[PDB]
Amino acid sequence: SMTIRFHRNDLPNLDNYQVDAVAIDTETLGLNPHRDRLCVVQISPGDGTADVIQIEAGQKKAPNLVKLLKDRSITKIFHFGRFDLAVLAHAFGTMPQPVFCTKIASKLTRTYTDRHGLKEICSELLDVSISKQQQSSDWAAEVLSQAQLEYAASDVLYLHRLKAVLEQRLERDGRTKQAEACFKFLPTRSELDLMGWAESDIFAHS
Amino acid sequence: SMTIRFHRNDLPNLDNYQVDAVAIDTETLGLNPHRDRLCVVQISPGDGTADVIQIEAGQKKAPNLVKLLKDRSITKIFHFGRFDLAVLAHAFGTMPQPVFCTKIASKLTRTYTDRHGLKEICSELLDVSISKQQQSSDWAAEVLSQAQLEYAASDVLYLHRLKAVLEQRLERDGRTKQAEACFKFLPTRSELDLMGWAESDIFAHS
Amino acid sequence: SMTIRFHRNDLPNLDNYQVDAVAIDTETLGLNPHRDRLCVVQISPGDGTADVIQIEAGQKKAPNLVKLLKDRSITKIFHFGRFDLAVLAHAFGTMPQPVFCTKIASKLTRTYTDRHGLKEICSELLDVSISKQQQSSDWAAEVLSQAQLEYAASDVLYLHRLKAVLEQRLERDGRTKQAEACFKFLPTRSELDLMGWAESDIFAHS
Amino acid sequence: SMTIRFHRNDLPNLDNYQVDAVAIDTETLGLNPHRDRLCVVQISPGDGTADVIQIEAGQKKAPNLVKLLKDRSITKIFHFGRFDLAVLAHAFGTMPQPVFCTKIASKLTRTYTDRHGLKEICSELLDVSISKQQQSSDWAAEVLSQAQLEYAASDVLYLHRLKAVLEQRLERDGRTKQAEACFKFLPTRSELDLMGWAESDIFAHS
Amino acid sequence: SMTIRFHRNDLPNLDNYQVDAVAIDTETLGLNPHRDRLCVVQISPGDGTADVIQIEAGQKKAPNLVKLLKDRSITKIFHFGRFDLAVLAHAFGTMPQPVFCTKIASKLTRTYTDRHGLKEICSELLDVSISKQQQSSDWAAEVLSQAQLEYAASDVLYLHRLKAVLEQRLERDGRTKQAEACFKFLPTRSELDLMGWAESDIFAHS
Amino acid sequence: SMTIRFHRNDLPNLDNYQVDAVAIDTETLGLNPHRDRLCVVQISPGDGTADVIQIEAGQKKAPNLVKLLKDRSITKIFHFGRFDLAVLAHAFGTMPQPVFCTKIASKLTRTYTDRHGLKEICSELLDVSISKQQQSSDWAAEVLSQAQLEYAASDVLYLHRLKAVLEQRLERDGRTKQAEACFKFLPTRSELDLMGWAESDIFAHS
Amino acid sequence: SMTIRFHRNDLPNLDNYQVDAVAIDTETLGLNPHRDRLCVVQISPGDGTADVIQIEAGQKKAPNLVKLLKDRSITKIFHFGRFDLAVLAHAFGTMPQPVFCTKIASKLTRTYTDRHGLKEICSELLDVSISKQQQSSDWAAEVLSQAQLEYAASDVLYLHRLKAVLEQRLERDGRTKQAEACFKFLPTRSELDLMGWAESDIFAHS
Amino acid sequence: SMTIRFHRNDLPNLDNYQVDAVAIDTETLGLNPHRDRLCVVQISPGDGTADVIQIEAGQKKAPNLVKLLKDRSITKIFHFGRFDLAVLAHAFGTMPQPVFCTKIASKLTRTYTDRHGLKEICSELLDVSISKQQQSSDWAAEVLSQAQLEYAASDVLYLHRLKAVLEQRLERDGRTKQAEACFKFLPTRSELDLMGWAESDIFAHS
Ligand SMILES: [Mg+2]
Ligand SMILES: [Mg+2]
Ligand SMILES: [Mg+2]
Ligand SMILES: [Mg+2]
Ligand SMILES: [Mg+2]
Ligand SMILES: [Mg+2]
Ligand SMILES: [Mg+2]
Ligand SMILES: [Mg+2]
Ligand SMILES: [Mg+2]
Ligand SMILES: [Mg+2]
Ligand SMILES: [Mg+2]
Ligand SMILES: [Mg+2]
Ligand SMILES: [Mg+2]
Ligand SMILES: [Mg+2]
Ligand SMILES: [Mg+2]
Ligand SMILES: [Mg+2]
Incomplete structure (x- = not known):
């Protein structure tokens, strides 16, 4: 469709990605990155379209996508990036940075609810x-399936809008600095997950 | 005693504190910083002596101690700094940094135990x-009491030695970079505690 | 609408409030009064209309509303006043009294159910x-939104009727005196919440 | 002994009880007042002696003791009076008042511990x-047995000293008014226990 | 209606009750028999009609109903008689016997489900x-209300049919003798509930 | 119907069962094999038809079915065979083998879900x-009832198709060998259930 | 020793057992009667001596012991007979009756403790x-070993004394009739355990 | 000492290992094999001596030890081999087999206890x-340290004796065949742990 471009293995070029931020999500065979391989990377430059990239079993390289992940001038937007960052780093060897996580931003702004899922926050x-x-x-x-492509694209088509609104909310309620420190730590949080602390809050007393 | 110097309100001077790192702990009326005031700050320059400072009810200033807290060239060593950083920032208005936390360092090195208390790690x-x-x-x-002064001093008399050993262990098992990122985030973790997230792992999925 | 009067900051006057009891509820940014500011006060004199007052960030005064809160000849009716009393006292510095809580009254009369929410008790x-x-x-x-104003007004439009029925039930089953003692203590219960005991039943053994 | 006077049924007179406060505890057949009868009332006028009164099965009256319970000029001191007040009211038909509870006072002052038992607080x-x-x-x-008499007396021999210290602590940390409101409500809390709410925090949301 | 006869206080006579078994249920103000008074007794002779008897506050006698409860030649059928037996004994001073409990019988026959409510077993x-x-x-x-009368009657209109089917099932799967021993003990189980063991399985190890 | 053949006690012959694998499920009076007798065995040769066999109370023999259970050249396919194997071995004295369990196979392939029921996996x-x-x-x-026969047949009509797809998935994600070892152990797992370890993971640390 | 007589398989005669009550306990290979065989029966006629009987693997008969178990004029005393009755009935085919259980009697009299073990109640x-x-x-x-014989004998040497004291306590606190009904039901409780309800309180609501 | 031979990296030869079974345990940096490296392998040929082998960081080969692990004519004895098998397979690439696990054997024989640790079973x-x-x-x-060598050797010095006794117990209580099937599956259980199912009972219903 005009909204969703499908690719095998990698983006064909970065012509669509001369941007300051990209929205990213992934699909996997499950929640254990050491067991459950990366299957799909979905990414949007924020222009109302999305690229859905099918990742093959055993695929070790995705050079164009990895250029974006490494590019420190490009903010990678996730909803709950903690998981996607670990999966991407495990798959291709690069920990993406810098990042913005709309779920952390939601937790720091939507103090009146425990519902921080993407569907709920997009509606609200x-x-x-x-x-x-x-x-x-x-x-x-x-x-x-085309249904699967649409689900995957829906994960990234709105993250730029979500980040715009959440930045306004962070500034309104005075927590921009704390959010930014969380975003700086998040790549390490994902590293610690891959290293063996996925089930531990490293900052907890016990 | 020659090991423990007692003070009211503040250090009398910083002659003893021309150092690159200081060891700090606190005593309070309990675990809720908004309810339970700061009562004691204990601090050591790492030379085998300790200063124990009695903090008065309503005391808003401790200029010499706060100079050390603000000094970015002086690393503040804690065991579980998450709590002490919040108490100190709440008491005097300065979030100490940079920091080293021996409890986080223990969690990242002593992977064979769930016992990360100061007594256990000092023995081991x-x-x-x-x-x-x-x-x-x-x-x-x-x-x-003198007993209380000795307990308070014991909290800081050994943190420099502990940091020395834990840095060696972090380098041996390859986690120095992740530990340092945790130390950089810890002041924000303490800020978030004071702001209302003391009971939430901000990085958790739900 | 004729049922709902909207105001910024405060009631414009107390012409509508020459009454012996008022019904009150609030809206906030969440359940932590130290973190989550007061946003709306909704109040009804019991005549089938409601005033919905938008409270600004940083607003420290609401003189006309606070006159009602302080007026000991005016009973303030809440459904679960424990929370609203803490929020109001935190916002404006006055602990409202005396009070009637329809949720406590429900717990003391509707002994056949664990459902004491406002919607359930209004229906029944x-x-x-x-x-x-x-x-x-x-x-x-x-x-x-007008939808939000209607939700806020619905919280107070019926509390006078609810109090009338619950007083009859309290008298029928013989617990008026115990209910009144609970209402006398409730302002202290809210104070203790603000002071640091929000998570503790002060009367529990352990 | 000179410290412990034993009686059957009631105090023989109130010559020893021309005081402003009395310390009281009870012994029963268990923790369910409707099932488990009152067996012993132990009471001290605060002079370093105690009266231990054996209560018979089916005993409905204890006129001299009940005079003290009803006397509003005499404060009845308990450690966890919530239980004793219910047992005494159930046994003799009078809810004692006014009261001071050293366990509530401990909870409001000893904010650094969860240990509020009589042995712990007497030691500390x-x-x-x-x-x-x-x-x-x-x-x-x-x-x-004499051992039982000594245990029972130990429950009341020190409550006047404990109340003296806890009043100082309440004033030091600024919670005297809240403690007094808790003491005023406590007789109702015990009434509600007898009425069927022993297992419910009446002030809880749910 | 022809199916439901309403009465105040008691059955007017026992002309309808020259039977070998009666079906009984009750309505109360809640689940605590010492707090929550008996409000309704509903009873059926098994002929497809039901009597619904409104019990007044403070009512101590219901002579015609109590004749049936005491009559050892008349089996009293309940669904979960454990509660109704306690309520009836508490209200009128007679523990009904002998009894048949369709819920115990269901537990001993419907070994393929954990759903033993009256609606479920009537359907199945x-x-x-x-x-x-x-x-x-x-x-x-x-x-x-008539709605309430219909609900109350529905509790007893089918218990004779249910007992007939459950007796067949008990005989088919070989547990008639154990069921009968449970029915003989059930009045004591209800007595123990009234005596203070409502929350304890008296046969449990601990 | 042409899809479902009903039998009493046993298959009439094995003319339909000259196959390399059969699909089997059972119905019982509940989940405790020592208490809850076998009632139905449903079996399919994989040709789109099913045999539903009613098992009588006390039935000790089913010679034609048991020939299939013992035949080591015939793989017995179950969904959660752990239970059916215990029930069948208890009923007729033969532990069926070799086996394929589609639920174990689902757990080893559908790593993205916790839903491994037959309805869910047949749909997906x-x-x-x-x-x-x-x-x-x-x-x-x-x-x-015919409804019951249809439910029972639906349990076995699709297991051959399910096994075909799950074998492909096991090979794709590289776990065929581990699945086969689980299938070899499963008869012992069912034996251990009958022997008294139904509630214990024999491989757990504690 | 003079206190402990050891036997293989059965008592040699009943010369020592011309008594109105016997004290009994058992030893097994564990707590699952279907898995864990009976190994020892220990029994005392109440005269300060005990017989310890070693039961062989596969032993189906113990005629002299079983005469006592069947004798309805001889009360069998247990501490927690629920288990021993099931083990004995499973081993030899006779459910012993009538019975007295000192643990049930303790639960109905020692209302001030949750500790109802034999050691605790013998001491107290x-x-x-x-x-x-x-x-x-x-x-x-x-x-x-002789140590094992002494442990086994200690289980029965004091049950007659314990029953004597507990009968006095049951009469003092008015629960003799309820205790006796529990003792009458206990053989059925043990039967239901053997039948498959060992993990269910048959009298529970759910 | 004469009991304990220390080695770096590997056994120097297999002169001591011309045996039918070897006893093995390991030491690691913790319980997560992907994070926590193998540090020590301790092994005994059953002759009352032990070899303690220090494994270096990054060590990929231990040829003499691995010859024993691969040798299908040599049974590898563990106490809780589930963990050691995973650690050894992860370290050197060979899953040891065949195996005997004294902890599984204890669970199948010591049915009277939940304590299956090596210290407890060696004592008993x-x-x-x-x-x-x-x-x-x-x-x-x-x-x-020598203390560490002694602890490590104590893990293997007695496993041959333990296996001898447990084989007798398995034969006595009739579970030899089930134990052997567990031992055959255990290498797969350890494989599944390494593959991502360490936290799942693969045989559980859900
Ligand atoms: Mg996604
Ligand atoms: Mg995501
Ligand atoms: Mg400290
Ligand atoms: Mg500290
Ligand atoms: Mg509201
Ligand atoms: Mg409210
Ligand atoms: Mg006492
Ligand atoms: Mg007390
Ligand atoms: Mg009913
Ligand atoms: Mg009922
Ligand atoms: Mg089925
Ligand atoms: Mg099945
Ligand atoms: Mg025993
Ligand atoms: Mg016993
Ligand atoms: Mg070891
Ligand atoms: Mg081991």
């Missing part, structure tokens, strides 16, 4: 309804 | 036995 | 259906 | 060691 | 759909 | 919707 | 100290 | 007291 903050996938998907399937 | 890493206070203390008492 | 006791707000609201928004 | 606040009874006692036995 | 065993009351009822109300 | 892997039985069934009833 | 009620076995024993060993 | 089954290490050890230390 953007008046955008994204459909939640009900049946679980084998994202390692050789052929991905 | 330093062959130093520190006596644990058994009965709970009113640290807001007008007169502090 | 008054045959009045109030719509529950489904999506969470940013009550600190510069502009409040 | 009074430097008085009271022996804890290790084996459980049948307090309904026809004959009480 | 009788192909009879009884409507569950959704909103909670004040059964102490001076005036009971 | 086969695009086959099987209706879940909502009301609980007495499977020991003398007469089984 | 009899002033008799019995040594608890610290290391776990293989009671199926071909040769039992 | 062998009358051998092994000292438990109290303080936690850094097993990655460049220099291991």
Whole structure:
């Protein structure tokens, strides 16, 4: 479709990615990065379109995508980047930075709710309804459905708008500096997950 | 005693504190910084002596101590600095930095135990036995006992040795960079505690 | 509308409030009064209308509303006043009294259920259906919607009727005196919450 | 002994009780006042002696003791009066008042510990060691041992000293007014226990 | 209606009750028999009709109903008689016996489910759909609704049919003798509840 | 129907069972094999038809079915065979082997979900919707309904297709060898359940 | 010794057992009667001596002991008979009756404690100290130690004294009738354990 | 000492290992094999001596030890081999087999206890007291203490005796075949741990 570009292995070029921030999500075979391989990277330059990239089993390189991940002048926007950063670093050897996490930003601004999922915050903050996938998907399937492409694109099509609103909220309630420190630490939080502390709050007393 | 110097309100001067790192702990009326005032600051320059400073109710200033807290060329060593940093920032208005936390360092090196208390790690890493206070203390008492001064000093007399050993262990098992990122974030972790997130892991999914 | 009067900062006058009891609720940025500011005070004199007052960030005074809060000849009716009393005292410096809490009264009369929410008790006791707000609201928004005004007004439009029925039930089952003692203590319960005991039943054994 | 006077049913007179406050504890057959009868009332006028009164099965009256319970000019001191007030009111028909509870006072002053038992607070606040009874006692036995009399007396011999110290601590940390409101409510808390709410915090949200 | 006869205080006579078994349920102000008075007794002779008896506050006698409760030649059928037996014994001073409990019988026969409620077992065993009351009822109300009468009657209109089917199932799977021993003990189980063991399995190890 | 053949006690012959694998499920009176007898065995040769065999109370033999269970050249396919293997071994004295368990295979392949029920995996892997039985069934009833026969047949009509897809997934993600070792152990796991370890993970540390 | 007579398989005669009550305990290979065989029966006629009977693997008969178990004129005293009754009935085919259980009697009299073990109640009620076995024993060993014989005898040497005291306590606090009903039901409680309800309180609501 | 031979990296030869079974344990930096490297392998040929082998950081080969691990004619005895098998396979690339696990064997024989630790079973089954290490050890230390060597040797010096006794117990209580099936599966259980199922019972329903 005009909204969703599908690719195998990597972006074909970075012509669409002369931007200051990109929105990223991933699909995997599950929540254990050492067991469950990366299957899809979905990314948007913020212009209302998305690229959905199918990652092959055993794929070690994605040079164009990795250029964006390494580029320190490009902010990588995630919703709950803690997981995606670990998966991406594990897959391609580069820990993306710098980052903005809309879920951390939601936790620091939407102090009246415990519901910080992407669907909930898109409805509340953007008046955008994204459909939640009900049946679980084998994202390692050789052929991905158009339904799967649409779900994957919906994860990134709105993160730039979400970041814009959450930055306003962070400034309004006075927590911009703390959010930024969380974003600076988040790559280390993901590293510690890969290293063996996925189940531990390193800052907890016990 | 020759090991422990007692002071009211503040250090009398910084003649003893021409150092690159200081060891710090505090005593309070309890674990809620908004309710439970700061009562004692104990600090050591690492030379085998300690200063124990009695903090008065309503005391808003401690200029000599605060000079050390603000001095970015002086590393402040804590065991579980997350709490002390919040108490100190709440009391005097300065968030101390930069910091080294021996409890975070223990969690990242002593991967074979869940026991990361100061007494346990001093015994294991330093062959130093520190006596644990058994009965709970009113640290807001007008007169502090010599026993209380000794307990307070024991909290800081060994942190320089502990940091030396833990830095070696961090380098041996390859986690120096992650530890340093945790130390950079820790002042924000303490800020978030004071701001209302004391009971939340900001990096958790839910 | 004729049912709902909107105001900024404060009631314009007390012409509508020559009454023996007022019904009050609040909206905030969340459940932590030290973190989450007061955003809305909604109040009804019991005549089938409601005033919805938008409270600005940093607002320290609301003189007309505070006159009602201080007036010991005016009973302040809440549903779960424990929270609202703490928020109001924190915002404006006056602990409202005397009070009647329809949730405490429900607990002492509706001994056949664990459901003591306002919607449930309005349906059962008054045959009045109030719509529950489904999506969470940013009550600190510069502009409040008419939907938000209606939700806020629904919190206070029926508390006088509810108190009338609950007083009858308290007398029928013989617990008026105990309810009144609870209402006398409730301002202290809210004070203790602000002081640091929000998570503790002060009367519990342990 | 000179410290402990034993009585059957009631105090023989109130010659020893021309005082402004009395210290009281009880022994029962267990923690359920409707099932487990009152067996012993122990009381001290604060002069370093104690009266231990054996209560018979089915005993409905204790006129001299009840005169003290009703006397509003005499403060009844308990450690955790919530239970004793319910037992006494159930046994003799009078809810004692006014009261001072050293356990509530401890909770409001000893903010650095979760240990608020009588033995712990006597050691810490009074430097008085009271022996804890290790084996459980049948307090309904026809004959009480001297050991049992000593345990019962130890419960009341020090409450006046404890109240003196805790009043100083309440004033030092600024919570005298809140403590007094708790003491005023406590008789109602005990009434609500007898009425069927022993397992419910009436002030809880849910 | 022809199915439901309403009475105040007691059955007018026992002309309808020349039977070998009666079906009984009750309504109360809640689940604590010492606090929550008996409000309704509903009873059926098994002929497809039901008597619904409104019990007044403070009512100590119901002579015709109590004749049935005491009559050892008449089996009293309950669904979960453990509660009703305690309420009835508390209200009128007679522990009904002998009894049959369809819930105990269900537990001993319907070994393939954890759902032993009356609605579930009537649907499964009788192909009879009884409507569950959704909103909670004040059964102490001076005036009971026809809806309330129908709910109360539905509790007893089918227990004879249920007992017939459950007796067949008990015989089929070989547990008639154990069921009968449970029914013989059940009045004592209800007595122990009234005596103070409502929260304890007396046969448990600990 | 042409899809479902009903039998009493046993298959009439094995003309339909000249196959390399059979799909099997059972129905019982509940989840405790020592208490809850086998009531139904449902089996399919994989050709789109199913045999539903009613097992009588006290039935000790089913010679034709047991020939299939013992035949080591015939793989017995189950969904969660752990339970069925114990029930079958308990009923007829033969532990079926070798086996394939689609639930173990699902756990080893569908690493992105915790939902491993037959309905869920048939929908996801086969695009086959099987209706879940909502009301609980007495499977020991003398007469089984056509609805019950259809539910029982649905348990086995698709297991050959499910095994085909799961074998492909096991090979794709590299866990065929581990799955096969689990299938070899499963008969012992069921034996240990019958022997008294039904509630213990024998491989757990503690 | 003169206190302990050892036997293989059975009592040699009943010359010592012309009594109205016997005290009984057992030893097994564990707490699951279907898995863990009976190994020892220890029994006392109440005269200060005990018989310890070693039960062989596969032993189906113990005629002299079983005569006592069946004899309805002989009360069988246990501490927690619920388990021993199931083990004995499983081993020899006779459910012993009538019974007295000192643990049920303790629960109904010692309302001031949750500690109802034999050692605790012997110390408190009899002033008799019995040594608890610290290391776990293989009671199926071909040769039992004298230490094991002494432990086994200590289980029964004092139950007659314990029953005497507990009967007095039951009469004093008015619960003799309820205790007797519990003793009448206990054989059924043990039957239900053997039948498959060992983990269920049959009288519970859910 | 004559009992303990220390080696760096590997056994110097297999002259001592012309045996049918070897006893093995390991020491690591913690319980996560992907994070916590192998530090020590301790092994005994069953002759009352032990070899303690220090494993270097990054060591990928131990050819003589690995010859024993691969040798299918040599049974590898562990206490809780589930962990050691994963650590050894992760370190050197060979999954040891066949195996005997004394902890699984204990679980299948010592049905009267939940205590299956090596110290407990050595005391009970062998009358051998092994000292438990109290303080936690850094097993990655460049220099291991003689105390550490003795602890490590104590883990393997008695496993042959333990296996001898447990085989007798397995035969006595009839579970040899089930134990052997568990031992055959255990290498797969350890593989599944390394693959990502360390926290899941693969045989559980859910
Ligand atoms: Mg996604
Ligand atoms: Mg994401
Ligand atoms: Mg300290
Ligand atoms: Mg500290
Ligand atoms: Mg509101
Ligand atoms: Mg409210
Ligand atoms: Mg006492
Ligand atoms: Mg007391
Ligand atoms: Mg009912
Ligand atoms: Mg009922
Ligand atoms: Mg089935
Ligand atoms: Mg199945
Ligand atoms: Mg025993
Ligand atoms: Mg016993
Ligand atoms: Mg070891
Ligand atoms: Mg081991």
